[PDB]
Amino acid sequence: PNRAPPCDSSQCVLPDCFCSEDGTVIPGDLPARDVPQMITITFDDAINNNNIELYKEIFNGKRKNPNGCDIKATYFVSHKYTNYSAVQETHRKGHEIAVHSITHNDDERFWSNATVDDWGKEMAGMRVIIEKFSNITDNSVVGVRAPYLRVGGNNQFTMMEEQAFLYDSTITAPLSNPPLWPYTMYFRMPHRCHGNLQSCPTRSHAVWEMVMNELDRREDPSNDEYLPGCAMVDSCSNILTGDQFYNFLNHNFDRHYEQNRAPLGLYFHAAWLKNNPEFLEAFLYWIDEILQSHNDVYFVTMTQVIQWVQNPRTVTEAKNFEPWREKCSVEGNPACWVPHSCKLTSKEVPGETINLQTCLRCPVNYPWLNDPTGDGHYH
Ligand SMILES: *[C@@H]1O[C@H](CO)[C@@H](O[C@@H]2O[C@H](CO)[C@@H](O)[C@H](O)[C@H]2NC(C)=O)[C@H](O)[C@H]1NC(C)=O
Ligand SMILES: *[C@@H]1O[C@H](CO)[C@@H](O)[C@H](O)[C@H]1NC(C)=O
Ligand SMILES: [Zn+2]
Incomplete structure (x- = not known):
């Protein structure tokens, strides 16, 4: 069929399209040390x-990127x-809101076999x-x-193109050195379809993939001992103490920072941080230590990564990059008091x-798949 071809750097040009043969090349061919x-x-x-209180503790208005704006x-x-x-308040404060479906249906085979319309009801409905x-x-x-990071083959991405979504962040890339930069789906994925029984897209789709690089969970990365990576932080089941988590964050930061500076994805469930105070403490210690010591590290939204890919800025230029300064340091009042x-x-x-x-x-009605506005109207 119309299987997307391998990356062709000649007809895949910024800002609409970004690909490389293995997904490791830096946009705009900037030197890694300037990224x-x-x-x-x-x-x-x-x-x-x-x-809600956990997010206030993390995003306290005192943790700032090198541009002076709140992380x-x-x-x-x-x-x-x-x-x-x-x-609404999280969005007002400048964090990005994305969709994770209406039902969060725990039947993993539903997602991997869902129609275009099913994907639309779940994702466009949640929007x-x-x-x-x-x-x-x-x-x-x-x-x-x-x-459950269940990719929906071509159906998911057909939906996302028809619905004018900008990006997906469901596809996992196996632990690799160097890790992978985001890519668009116009061309063949630059890595294997990864995960149990996963159904990945094969055709061309005008959708960005904020690829989820697995992190290296090895407690002693100095061996050649082999361990599967982990994409969601809470799926790294050997992380049991705050010290282990701290070293895990440093090791995977270095993997990215010392190679191609691919965006590093730290994908959490709040409950994992909340239920394990030493993990939250280690995470905040790490964040504060990284922010103080690095003038070249930015904690940004996913959309902000894509905006950089579309107009690559060096570390020096990044300080005045306008998309990264939207809702720089919002104070003000909530949209409604009660x-x-x-x-x-x-x-x-x-x-x-x-x-x-x-x-x-x-x-009048609780919003759900067949009535996302909750208006109770007849269709
Ligand atoms: C839902 O979330 C809102 C927004 O965080 C909470 O709103 C607060 O509500 C209290 C009422 O005691 C007000 O004094 C604050 O001004 C509100 N905060 C903001 C930022 O607007 C609300 O408590 C939450 N409710 C539940 C049940 O989760
Ligand atoms: C949405 O926000 C705008 C901007 O504050 C406000 O004027 C408007 O009334 C809000 N809409 C609804 C339906 O509350
Ligand atoms: Zn979930």
């Missing part, structure tokens, strides 16, 4: 009072139990929920990450009553 080391901290799943993270938000006033109940009007909800607490039901979620907090008036 800012980007770090994309991300958090999956619901934003609510289970984790920024990306939230892949799933619908159930999410507080949309909190999503509708966020844009409405968090009142986000600037079309900045543009990223997708699938539950959000509505909506107790909602829906025949799509039979039995449950789910509280949804929003600055908007409560909808």
Whole structure:
């Protein structure tokens, strides 16, 4: 069929398209020593009072990138139990909001075999929920990450192109040295389809892939002992102490910083940090140590990585790069002082009553797959 061809650097030109033969080449062929080391901290799943205080402790308005702006993270938000006033405030503070589906269906075979329409209802539907109940009007909800990192073959990416999503961050790249830069899906993936029973795209799709490089979990990377990598931090099951986590962060930082400076992805679940105080303590110690010692390291959103790829800036130029200064150091007031607490039901979620907090008036129905606005209208 129309299998995407291997990367052709002649018809894949910035800013629409970026590829290299193995995914390790730096955009714009900048020297590695002049490339800012980007770090994309991300958090999956619901934003609510289970984790709102954790995010305040991390993103305290005192941790700043070398451009003077607050460090920024990306939230892949799933619908159930999410507080949309909190999503709105997180966005107001300059963090990126992306979608992680409505249902977070735990049947992994559903995702790997879902139709284009199924992917659309889950992901475009979740975008509708966020844009409405968090009142986000600037079309900045543009990223997708699938539950359980289940890639949806071509169907997922056909959906994302039809729905005008900017990027996916579901595809894992096996532990590699050097690690991989993001790539667009117009051309063949520069690495194997990785993971149990994974179905990866094969055709050309006008979608960016914020590829998830596995991290090296080896406690002593000096051997030649071989261990599978890990993409989600909490899937690195040998990390048991704060000291191990601290060394793990340094080792994988160095892997990126000392090679091709590919963006380093630190992909979290809030609960993993919250339930393990020594991990949170080690993480913050590490962040603060990296920020003080590096004038060339930026904690940025996923969209901000793509913006750099589209217009590569050296470390010196990065200080005044305007996309990285959007919502530089937001203070101000929340969109509403006391959000509505909506107790909602829906025949799509039979039995449950789910509280949804929003600055908007409560909808008549609990939003779900077949009614993402919660308006209860007939179709
Ligand atoms: C939902 O999230 C919002 C936003 O963080 C929380 O809103 C706070 O609500 C209290 C009410 O006691 C107000 O005093 C604050 O001004 C609000 N904060 C902001 C930043 O607007 C709300 O408490 C959350 N509710 C639940 C149930 O999770
Ligand atoms: C969304 O935010 C704008 C900007 O503050 C505000 O004027 C508008 O009323 C909000 N929309 C809704 C439906 O609350
Ligand atoms: Zn999830």
